Amino acid sequence: ASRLYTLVLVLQPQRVLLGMKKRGFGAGRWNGFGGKVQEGETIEDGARRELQEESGLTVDALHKVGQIVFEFVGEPELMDVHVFCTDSIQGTPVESDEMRPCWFQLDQIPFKDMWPDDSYWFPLLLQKKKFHGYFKFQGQDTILDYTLREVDTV
Ligand SMILES: CNc1cc(N2CCOCC2)nc(N)n1
């Protein structure tokens, strides 16, 4: 049993866009933009929708860069997160009720205030490598097990 999620990182040559989640799941942490995939939309449609809802941004093209599966102890559904990246965006990021966006220089990524798994796979993202990851969480702070490998096809 799994549920589809999206995560979108706007990565430009010297900077990456992150949003500070202000309520709900993962509140109080920086992350890319995204969320649940709905019935009746493709995964990529969902990524675009969440990007627009959370930042006002639209994009020309989204590129598949990763897939990460999360298990939370005691929770029946696995989280199947499809991770996308893009360089060219359309518009200027604006704050939503969900997210407060900011640009970060690539050597100033706030890992201590991000999901812990990001510390493991974000470098691969910045190095433009495609990846498959798995992280087992107890609660929201503790990684119990994980696997991470580069792949050819996401
Ligand atoms: C559990 N560690 C997570 C979860 C997550 N999510 C973003 C998309 O919605 C599903 C949860 N994003 C990151 N970077 N790490």
User: Measuring from atom 13 of ligand 1, which residue has the nearest CA?
Assistant: 115
Residue 40: CB partners within 8 Å, gap ≥ 6? none
> For a substitution probing ligand 1, which of 5, 18, 23 has the most ligand atoms within 8 Å of its CB?
5
For residue 114, the ligand 1 atom closest to its alpha carbon is 14
Residue with tokens 């009720």: 97
Please give the Cα distance from 83 to 98 (Å, whole number).
19
| Closest CA relative to residue 72, chosen from 7, 109, 111, 26 | 26
Instruction: State residue 124 phi and psi, 5-degree precision.
Output: -60, -40
Asked if residue 31 lies in contact with residue 115, where contact means CB atoms within 8 angstroms, the answer is yes
Minimum CA distance residue for ligand 1 atom 3: 115
Residue 92 CA, chain-centre distance (Å), reads 19
Q: Which token pair is 71?
A: 């298990």
First vs last C-alpha separation in the chain: 20
Resolution (A): 2.1
Q: Where are the alpha helices (DSSP H) in the chain?
A: 43-55, 118-126
Cα–ligand 1 centroid distance for 20 (angstroms):
13
| Residues 55 and 19: beta-carbon distance below 8 Å | yes
Gap between the Cα atoms of 103 and 86, Å rounded: 14
Size (the chain), residues? 154
Domain extent, residue 85, equals: 1-154
Task: Please give the distance, rounded to the nearest whole angstrom, from the Cα atom of residue 115 to the centre of ligand 1.
Answer: 7
Give the count of domains, the chain: 1
Experimental method: X-ray
Give the list of residues 6+ apart from residue 18 with CB closer than 8 angstroms, or none. 30, 31, 32, 101, 102, 103, 104, 109, 110, 114
CB 7 within 8 A of CB 32: yes
